[PDB]
Design a binder for this molecule. Structure first.
Ligand SMILES: C=CCN1CCC[C@@H]1CNC(=O)c1cc(S(N)(=O)=O)cc(OC)c1OC
Ligand SMILES: [Zn+2]
Length: 258
């Protein structure tokens, strides 16, 4: 009886195995655009993905993760609210059964069709497992997806999903360029928070881009053909793999833009 996104094991149950689920800095949150304050002291974010080395794509039973070589400073996130250098380890998405839900963060209670998370770790802690034990260990770049025009830079991801339908399947996924998943603007909101999956560790500086990317209906329909189950098991479509907004508590969301 492991955690997941069903009736019996979904987000309202997680606190029993992971009591931090009711903690002081949980994610995701609703971004109230009228209460977020412009912070002129933040910087421009620096997203340096030209040397990124993707390796593999894995269906982990929750989402699919595109994994990178993080054994050197190749694809790194710096600036904005961050001090130091954060290495890209993996990206994944959260999405819905229908276009009106899927994102984890919300904007004035608006749900997007999906949300991309680019997960990076703070090199001062040496490895990812040490970083997730620190309050400043991870930086997650979050990007909303709306349904409209296709995202050309996403199609290589879409076209490999048939090969990783079920939990525990992986495929070679070399030479994928994550720059093709970014919107034009790097305007963002930021706040201190958590992993949105168990173990829900309070180790994340969240950086959520204001500008969504557009993907096609055909692209997101291919996300919804994945399976939470392993091969040969009763089919459970991989949909609605999002945690809902959590209480903001004693936190301020800051804006990089006026
Ligand atoms: C070294 C320990 C930390 N490990 C322990 C098992 C998962 C946890 C790592 N969690 C993540 O990387 C992880 C984080 C997120 S999220 N939405 O960025 O918090 C999602 C995910 O899979 C959809 C993840 O699993 C790979
Ligand atoms: Zn995520």
């Amino acid at each position: 009886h492991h955690w997941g996104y069903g009736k019996h094991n979904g987000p309202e149950h997680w606190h029993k195995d992971f009591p931090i689920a009711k903690g002081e800095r949980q994610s995701p949150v609703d971004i109230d655009t009228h209460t977020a304050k412009y912070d002129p002291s933040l910087k421009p974010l620096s997203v340096s993905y030209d040397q990124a080395t993707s390796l593999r794509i894995l269906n982990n039973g929750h989402a699919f993760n595109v994994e990178f070589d993080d054994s050197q400073d190749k694809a790194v996130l710096k600036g904005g609210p961050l001090d130091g250098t954060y290495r890209l380890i993996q990206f994944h998405f959260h999405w819905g059964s229908l276009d009106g839900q899927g994102s984890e963060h919300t904007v004035d209670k608006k749900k997007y069709a999906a949300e991309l998370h680019l997960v990076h770790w703070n090199t001062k802690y040496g490895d990812f497992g040490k970083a997730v034990q620190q309050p400043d260990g991870l930086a997650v770049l979050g990007i909303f997806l709306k349904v409209g025009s296709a995202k050309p830079g996403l199609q290589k991801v879409v076209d490999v999903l048939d090969s990783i339908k079920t939990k525990g399947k992986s495929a070679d996924f070399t030479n994928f360029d994550p720059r093709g998943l970014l919107p034009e603007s790097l305007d963002y909101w930021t706040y201190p928070g958590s992993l949105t999956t168990p173990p829900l560790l309070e180790c994340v500086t969240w950086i959520v881009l204001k500008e969504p990317i557009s993907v096609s209906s055909e692209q997101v329909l291919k996300f919804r053909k994945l399976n939470f189950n392993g091969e040969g098991e009763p089919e459970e479509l991989m949909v609605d793999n999002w945690r809902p907004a959590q209480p903001l508590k004693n936190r301020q969301i800051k804006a990089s833009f006026k």
